[PDB]
Amino acid sequence: PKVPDDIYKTHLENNRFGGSGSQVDSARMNLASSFVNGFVNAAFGQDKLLTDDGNKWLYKNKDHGMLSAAASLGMILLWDVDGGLTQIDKYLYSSEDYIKSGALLACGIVNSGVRNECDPALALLSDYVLHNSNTMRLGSIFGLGLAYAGSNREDVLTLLLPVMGDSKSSMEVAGVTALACGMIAVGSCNGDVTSTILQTIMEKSETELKDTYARWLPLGLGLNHLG
Amino acid sequence: DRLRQTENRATRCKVERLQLLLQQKRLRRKARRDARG
Amino acid sequence: YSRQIKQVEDDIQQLLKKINELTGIKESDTGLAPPALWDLAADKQTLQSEQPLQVARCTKIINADSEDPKYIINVKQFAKFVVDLSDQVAPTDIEEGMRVGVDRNKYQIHIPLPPKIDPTVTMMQVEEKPDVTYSDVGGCKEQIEKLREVVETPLLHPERFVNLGIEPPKGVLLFGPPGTGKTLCARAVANRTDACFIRVIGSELVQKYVGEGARMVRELFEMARTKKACLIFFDEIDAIGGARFDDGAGGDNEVQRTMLELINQLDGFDPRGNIKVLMATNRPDTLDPALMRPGRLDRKIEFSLPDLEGRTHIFKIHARSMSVERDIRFELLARLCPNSTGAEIRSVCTEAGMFAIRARRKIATEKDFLEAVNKVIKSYAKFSATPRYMTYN
Ligand SMILES: Nc1ncnc2c1ncn2[C@@H]1O[C@H](COP(=O)(O)OP(=O)(O)OP(=O)(O)O)[C@@H](O)[C@H]1O
């Protein structure tokens, strides 16, 4: 069925073992609630206002959680490129950068492994790749590489090349940019190798502190051509 | 707030155009199958 | 090359057998595991088993007391005396019928008090579901649905029952032809369940002494009521109680006490509540009417011998695996065996496959199924276990 929603609701038997129940009162568990409407909604389910638990929580706290729910929406309509855009549209118009970025990531997720003649992933995500902030800037590109991974199109790859050449403070963003560029193409990639190694010398050579820096730019070099 | 209103209006007209093109392509695909069967 | 085949592999596999043994130098346990993993915590986390925690042997609570705690403690038979244990937990966890970890001189509280039960009933939970489904049980579909709405929606969503304000039925008997019937669909029930599935075979409850069966029934009901909902299966209740028929010298009282006390336990004075029980036997006419009372035996699932359609369906069910020349005549096979039971039918297909593999064949034929059925149903017709048991007498 479209709404099984049971394994979360299976957590009913364990409450009366060890004494009193309902001791779980944290907020991070609501993140798991995303997957409760997220993971089950794979294989072509639908949640018409059943993401309301995610909706008001997207209006409650956790900026990263708003991004999380809005990205989990793209798991919903995986491979439904023609119907999924109409369900995501309502979030592209959000007053929250986290929800809008998660809706851009959802548009990327829906196209992952499907080459549609209308290029709706490239055509919607392009305008956000160099965006002023980060929610729409950083997450503006991850779905596009997911949409255009196997369809290794170099034209939009060139469009995301100057993000390495942005030279802005992108300590988290340039790393995931190397993830997204390598997602399109890694290994024997002419522009992606050069852009990463030059940016590595430009910032990461003078500061090598945390694994955010040099665990994503090495992923952009040769993971696709590992065979 | 004005920049975001111009941005969301540009996005809208891009999405409304993409939905029309996807629907037109989907109808052409279907018309080929329904003519083969 | 052929007789020379045995010159390349040995030169490396014997060497393999040398280095694998040379790595295998952590063995000869006789009460151990690989000590790189057995004694993986062979550091100080061994010494903290000694100095932080001390013995704290078991105990038994006897009686409470006013104001300051001064509870009375049994050990097991050692001594029966009054202390206050300690102060690291609030004095509200002490109830009679419980066991604390208590020292011999300091009498520390240590942990709160769990109940003590027989290890046999802990072993008696099966925690394994056989690989049988609700699809591979055909011939009793209305029996199937009658047991579907006993062990599902109470286990699933209760809002329907709450909305209609109706308490679900509890006591359900499932019964059928002797030999073919309730057991394998009970395995299917245990397959499709989620909570615990406590097995009870009726023959084991009889003990050397008198009244122990009452004690283990009390213990199993207590450990069942530790759970929110749990399933109880009963097999061959005919031996665990027929009827109170005592005359002159006492006859079969030792089991009578057990059956009557479980009858007291099922009905009256704050019952198990959310515990679903079910029983299956071999002869129903000999059961006691008090056990037959509704509230303990509300539903009466009765399986009969399938007429034709169930026979055709079970012929489908057991025989999707053997080789045949495409076409079959399974319906005429079922017509050939009118009064035939399901395990008999599976035996027929088994012996047909055995006849096929007699000399060299790989696919049985229609005449092979004929050779199965005639030497099953009308060559072993002398016993067949049916006639004195279809009257259940
Ligand atoms: N509907 C059915 N479809 C297929 N096989 C069935 C069906 N009903 C019974 N059987 C067969 O019954 C056999 C075992 O019967 P089962 O033991 O469950 O019956 P019973 O009445 O509980 O008797 P007993 O436990 O005393 O043998 C199995 O071989 C199984 O294939």
Swiss-Prot record, chain A:
This one is known as 26S proteasome non-ATPase regulatory subunit 2
Q: Phosphoserine-modified residues are where?
A: S20, S22
Q: Which residues carry this modification: N6-acetyllysine?
A: K210
What's its job? Component of the 26S proteasome, a multiprotein complex involved in the ATP-dependent degradation of ubiquitinated proteins. This complex plays a key role in the maintenance of protein homeostasis by removing misfolded or damaged proteins, which could impair cellular functions, and by removing proteins whose functions are no longer required. Therefore, the proteasome participates in numerous cellular processes, including cell cycle progression, apoptosis, or DNA damage repair. Binds to the intracellular domain of tumor necrosis factor type 1 receptor. The binding domain of TRAP1 and TRAP2 resides outside the death domain of TNFR1.
Q: How does it assemble?
A: Component of the 19S proteasome regulatory particle complex. The 26S proteasome consists of a 20S core particle (CP) and two 19S regulatory subunits (RP). The regulatory particle is made of a lid composed of 9 subunits, a base containing 6 ATPases and few additional components including PSMD2. Interacts with RPGRIP1L. Interacts with CRY1 in a KDM8-dependent manner.
The record's tissue-specificity note reads: Found in skeletal muscle, liver, heart, brain, kidney, pancreas, lung and placenta.
Recorded family membership: Belongs to the proteasome subunit S2 family.
The residues bearing each PC repeat, given as ranges, are: 68-101, 102-138, 139-173, 176-210
| Taxon lineage | Eukaryota, Metazoa, Chordata, Craniata, Vertebrata
Parent-record interval covered: 342 to 568 of 908
From Swiss-Prot, chain B:
Taxonomy, superkingdom? Eukaryota
Compartments in which it is found: Nucleus, Nucleolus; Nucleus; Cytoplasm, Cytosol
Disulfide connectivity for this sequence is none
- What does UniProt say about this protein's domains? Contains three domains that function in concert to promote proteasomal degradation of bound substrates. Contains a ubiquitin-like domain (Ubl) toward its N-terminus that is necessary to promote substrate degradation. In the middle, two domains termed Catch1 and Catch2 are necessary and sufficient to interact with unstructured regions within substrates. The long C-terminal region associates with the proteasome.
Q: Its function?
A: Facilitates the ubiquitin-independent proteasomal degradation of stimulus-induced transcription factors such as FOSB, EGR1, NR4A1, and IRF4 to the proteasome for degradation. Promotes also the degradation of other substrates such as CBX4. Plays a role in inhibiting the activity of glucokinase GCK and both glucose-induced and basal insulin secretion.
Q: How does it assemble?
A: Interacts with GCK; the interaction occurs preferentially at low glucose levels. Interacts with the proteasome.
Q: What is this protein called?
A: Midnolin
Q: Which organism is it from?
A: Homo sapiens (Human)
Curated annotation (Swiss-Prot), chain C:
Q: Which domain of life is it from?
A: Eukaryota
* Biological-process GO terms, alphabetical: osteoblast differentiation; positive regulation of proteasomal protein catabolic process; proteasome-mediated ubiquitin-dependent protein catabolic process; ubiquitin-dependent protein catabolic process
Q: Where in the cell is it found?
A: Cytoplasm
Q: Any keyword DNA-binding?
A: no
In which broad location class does this protein mainly occur, judging by the first location in its UniProt entry? cytoplasm
Q: Which Gene3D superfamilies match?
A: 1.10.8.60, Nucleic acid-binding proteins, P-loop containing nucleotide triphosphate hydrolases
Processing and modification events after translation: Monoubiquitinated by RNF181. Phosphorylated. Dephosphorylated by UBLCP1 which impairs PSMC2 ATPase activity and disrupts 26S proteasome assembly.
* Description of how the protein assembles with itself and partners: Component of the 19S proteasome regulatory particle complex. The 26S proteasome consists of a 20S core particle (CP) and two 19S regulatory subunits (RP). The regulatory particle is made of a lid composed of 9 subunits, a base containing 6 ATPases including PSMC2 and few additional components. Interacts with NDC80/HEC; this interaction is detected only during M phase. Interacts and SQSTM1. Interacts with PAAF1. Directly interacts with TRIM5. (Microbial infection) Interacts with HIV-1 Tat.
What is the protein name for this chain? 26S proteasome regulatory subunit 7
Q: Which organism is it from?
A: Homo sapiens (Human)
Q: Which gene encodes it?
A: PSMC2
